[PDB]
């Protein structure tokens, strides 16, 4: 199963890799090229928002008619992103001791 | 009624299903989605930043 | 101890507005909510929209829209209910309560977690 | 949309339990678990009794017990003395940042 999601930074769902974790590079010299790094150990991720109205339907022809946001009910919220703490900095602490054979 | 993060109003008129009138609409647009035009510091006549 | 403090009595006839002003002594107003209850004698309790004094975003209740406004002001720490075109049944006690916790993370305005009340304000009509 | 459903008045006699209970529409009882009580000495402001269906503050001592059935949500006291001669109000989130309050117990001691 591979599933075709899009992202910059920060790979989310995916196949997983075993044993430890392992980088993927091109020449390991110049700094032109991306560097991969694929974990072992998964770390939860949570994404949030404030309410909405609906879908305000705006009609601008013979049938076609889009969605805009209409009103919102309740108070300004920032839509935020969490992740756990310990379980972040011993994963980057795994990437950076196992980075660590390329470098002595 | 307060006020608001990121998003603006922008009541703007659009053409219905007949072509002869045109009606005022309003929405909720977030701020990089708006982009103003001219040169002056009239806040006003904002614009849809995928129109140019 | 925090306190809430309100004005007094008012006695007002059919067709003009009324002012209730409410003040939080004791801690930082701006991270908490502050709801609003009306208390005709003799039957329960009503429910007024919640008042944000950190942004001062309003939101009221069903048949209020339009005749009641609440306005914040953070430099003397109190609020102001400005309700107009009074009514015969209008004769009551206005209460101010202190809400939920602001987060900036969850929409925790309508929790009734309504912890200190004021003595409220009597206003009657004739 | 109106007030929640709750009888006019309840009565007993001291040294045994009573329990209310409060009936309300699905989208307001039913699917939040945001519902209190207060109660109301005739004179002076209420005080809250718990905060959510069930969880007892500091300052009042282990005697109200809460809790939620289906549509509806009860309120059981333990123990009756003569300083309960006070009204009793439900409260409830209702959804689109509105709260619904109740209609009122009155309780007595015989």
């Known amino acids: 199963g591979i599933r075709p999601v899009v992202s910059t930074q920060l790979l989310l769902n995916g196949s997983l890799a075993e044993k430890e974790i392992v980088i993927r590079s091109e020449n390991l010299t110049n700094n032109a090229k991306i560097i991969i790094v694929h974990l072992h150990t998964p770390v939860e991720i949570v994404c949030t928002r404030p309410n909405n109205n609906t879908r305000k339907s705006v009609r601008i022809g013979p049938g076609q008619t889009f969605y805009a946001t209409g009103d919102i009910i309740g108070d300004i919220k920032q839509a935020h992103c969490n992740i756990s703490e310990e379980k972040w900095n011993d994963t980057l602490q795994k990437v950076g001791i196992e980075l660590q054979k390329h470098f002595p | 009624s307060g006020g608001v993060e990121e998003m603006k109003n922008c009541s703007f008129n659009t053409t219905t299903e007949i072509r002869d009138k045109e009606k005022k609409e309003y929405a909720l647009f977030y701020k990089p989605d708006i982009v103003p035009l001219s040169e002056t510091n009239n806040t006003s006549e904002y614009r849809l930043i995928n129109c140019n | 101890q925090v306190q809430l403090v309100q004005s007094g009595a008012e006695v007002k006839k059919p067709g003009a507005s009324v002012k209730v002003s409410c003040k939080a002594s004791?801690?930082?107003?701006?991270?908490?909510?502050m709801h609003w209850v009306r208390q005709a004698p003799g039957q329960g309790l009503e429910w007024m929209g919640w008042?944000?004094?950190?942004?001062?975003?309003?939101n009221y209740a069903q048949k209020f829209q339009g005749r009641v406004t609440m306005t914040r002001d953070t430099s003397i720490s109190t609020a102001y209910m400005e309700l107009s075109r009074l009514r015969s049944d209008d004769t009551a006690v206005y209460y101010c309560?202190?809400?939920?916790?602001?987060?900036?993370?969850?929409?925790?305005?309508?929790?009734?977690?309504?912890?200190?009340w004021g003595q409220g304000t009597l206003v009657t009509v004739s | 949309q109106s007030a929640l459903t709750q009888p006019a008045s309840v009565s007993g006699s001291p040294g045994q339990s009573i329990t209310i209970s409060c009936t309300g529409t699905?989208?307001?009882?039913?699917?939040?678990?945001?519902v209190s009580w207060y109660q109301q000495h005739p004179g002076k402001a209420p005080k809250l009794m718990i905060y959510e269906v069930s969880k007892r503050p500091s300052g009042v001592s282990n005697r109200f017990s809460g809790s939620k059935s289906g549509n509806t949500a009860s309120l059981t006291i333990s123990g009756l003395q003569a300083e309960d001669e006070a009204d009793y109000y439900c409260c409830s989130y209702a959804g689109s940042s509105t709260v619904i309050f109740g209609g009122g117990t009155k309780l007595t001691v015989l």
């Open positions: 309560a202190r809400g939920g916790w602001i987060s900036l993370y969850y929409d925790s305005s309508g929790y009734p977690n309504f912890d200190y």
């Open positions: 008042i944000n004094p950190n942004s001062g975003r309003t």
């Open positions: 004791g801690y930082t107003f701006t991270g908490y909510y």
């Open positions: 699905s989208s307001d009882v039913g699917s939040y678990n945001l």
